[PDB]
């Protein structure tokens, strides 16, 4: 089971990398665990999108203030 | 029972796809 979980997390990371999702190993693992635990995929996707938007807004603010 | 030609099938498919795309775009804009 542990090997299967590791393989699944690696597959998800590879999919994210090919898709250029911007997810790291910890975030991808957390998303996978939440989905396996029954978390609504729409809520998780909205959370990921909001975090990416916040990171992009913070980078834009840092580039505008510099 | 003259089978619909590939061109006619493609035309009907494109027309349906275009109408559905226009409807989706109108709904999105609204």
């Amino acid at each position: 089971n542990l090997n299967a979980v590791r393989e699944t997390m690696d597959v998800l990371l590879e999919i994210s990398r090919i898709l250029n999702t911007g997810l790291d190993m910890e975030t991808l693992s957390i998303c996978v665990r939440l989905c396996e635990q029954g978390i609504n995929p729409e809520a998780l996707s909205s959370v990921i999108k909001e975090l990416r938007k916040a990171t992009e807004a913070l980078k834009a603010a840092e580039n505008m203030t510099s | 029972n003259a089978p619909l030609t590939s061109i006619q099938i493609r035309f009907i498919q494109n027309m349906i796809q275009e109408t559905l795309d226009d409807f989706r775009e109108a709904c999105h804009r609204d």
Binding site: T8, L19, D24, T27, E42, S45, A57 | -
Partner: protein, 115 residues
Amino acid sequence: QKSPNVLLQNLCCRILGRSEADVAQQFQYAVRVIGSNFAPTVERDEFLVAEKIKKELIRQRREADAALFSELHRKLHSQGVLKNKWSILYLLLSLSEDPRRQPSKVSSYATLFAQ
């Protein structure tokens, strides 16, 4: 078993690279979004989501990303670790980015509302 809220907060802090105090507005927005009723995801079927992802990747001429996705999906299905494969597939599809389309650098204009 860290509560999902604490795990999401740690994930946000790790991904953004900022302290909890600097992400308070974003944390509130995230909490509002997650607690808000969201429309059903475009695809809630693992096989339908996989087929839609494959069709979208083939239509966008992104064959390498489609092959990588197919391999990851095969690995996930064979591993059998995830109980809700459809949810993970929907999440991955929602987060997919076209590698050929240069990431739309968030215009500095977003900073105007940050203050």
